[model samples]
Target: MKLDEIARLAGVSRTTASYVINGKAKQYRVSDKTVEKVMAVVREHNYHPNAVAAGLRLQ
Candidate 1:
């Protein structure tokens, strides 16, 4: 699912969902429960990060 859809499902803003998925939630001090909620939906949808970009970054 798209980030917007993920935000809608979690009843949070797109930025919030983005923060969670991008691993910036901790920097923003987001609650553990909120992180877990977002992660659960992400996992349920079998979402995968952009491996191509990540692979390039590590090269």
Candidate 2:
């Protein structure tokens, strides 16, 4: 799903959801429920968010 769609479903701003999925989890207060729901959708669709392009900066 697109970022906007996920954000809409989670009742959060797009920026917030992007932050959580992109490893800025601490920056946002996305609950486990929200993360679970997001992951469910992601798994269901076999989607992978572009952590790099999304500026995750993972190690």
Candidate 3:
């Protein structure tokens, strides 16, 4: 789903939703309810937080 769609479903702003998804949002103003709602959508869509992409590791 698109960012706006996810934000609408979670009742949050696109920025906030992006933050939560990217795992870089340090604003503590976000409540548990909001997090849960956003997370539910993330899980439903199997979306992963956009962490730094890791390349194949060679042992």
Candidate 4:
């Protein structure tokens, strides 16, 4: 599944899921509990980024 889909399943914002998945959770101040939830969904989907190309397109 895609990262947005992962965030939906985890009941968080896409930004939050991205932060956790990208290992920026601590820097972004996401809670460990939130991180755990996000990761559970990621593990469920075995998701990874093909998102870099799209994400960096934004200014």
Candidate 5:
């Protein structure tokens, strides 16, 4: 699944999902409750970044 899909399932906005996934939640002061919700969806779906992003990571 995609980030947007995780956001949809977690009942949060895409930016919020991105923040949690990128480990910036504390920097941005996201609530633990919100973090838990987003993470649950991510785990349930076994989500990963798309191919473009994975390529960027290697580059």
Candidate 6:
């Protein structure tokens, strides 16, 4: 699922969702409950964050 979709499903702003998805929830002081809410959707969808194709992993 896309980041925006996750945010909408979690009932949080895109910024909040991004923070949680990017593993910055603690840095942003997001509550555990909200983190759990966002994570549940992510797990349900089996979503994995993607990185830009730069051929770095082939090195």
lDDT of 2 by residue, 1-59 (tens): 78777677655677776754564545667657557766555455555665446436656
- Top lDDT hit: 4
Candidate order by decreasing lDDT: 4, 6, 5, 1, 3, 2
TM-score of 1: 0.68
Candidate 5 residue 7 C-alpha distance from true site, Å: 0.6
Q: Write the per-residue lDDT of candidate 4 for residues 1-59, one digit (tens) a residue.
A: 77788888987888888876665678787768778888888777787666444355545
Computed on alpha carbons, the lDDT of every model, listed in order, comes to 0.71, 0.62, 0.66, 0.76, 0.74, 0.75
Q: What's the CA RMSD for each of the models? A: 3.2, 3.7, 5.0, 5.2, 4.1, 4.4
Q: What TM-score does model 6 achieve against the real structure? A: 0.69
Error of 1 at 51 (Å): 3.6
Candidate 3 per-residue C-alpha lDDT over 1-59 given as tens digits, one digit per residue, 9 for 90 to 100:
77777777767888777755654445545556567777677666666655566556825
Pick by lDDT: 4 or 6, better one: 4
- Which segments of candidate 6 are over 4 A away from where they belong? 52-59
* Per-residue C-alpha lDDT of model 5 across residues 1-59, encoded as one tens digit per residue: 78898888888888887766765567676768677888778777877555544345544
lDDT-best of 3 and 6: 6
TM-score, each model?
0.68, 0.51, 0.59, 0.69, 0.66, 0.69
Q: Which stretches of candidate 3 lie over 4 Å from their true place?
A: 25-28, 49-59
Model 5, residue 44: distance off in Å is: 1.6
Clashing pairs in 5: none
Greater lDDT among 2 and 3 belongs to 3
Q: Where does candidate 3 have its weakest 10-residue lDDT segment? A: 22-31
How far off is residue 11 in model 6, in Å?
A: 1.2
TM-score of 5: 0.66
Model 6 per-residue lDDT at 7: 86
- State how far residue 25 of model 5 sits from its true place (Å): 1.5
lDDT tens readout by residue for model 1, 1-59:
88888778865778877777776678676667668878676666765456554445554
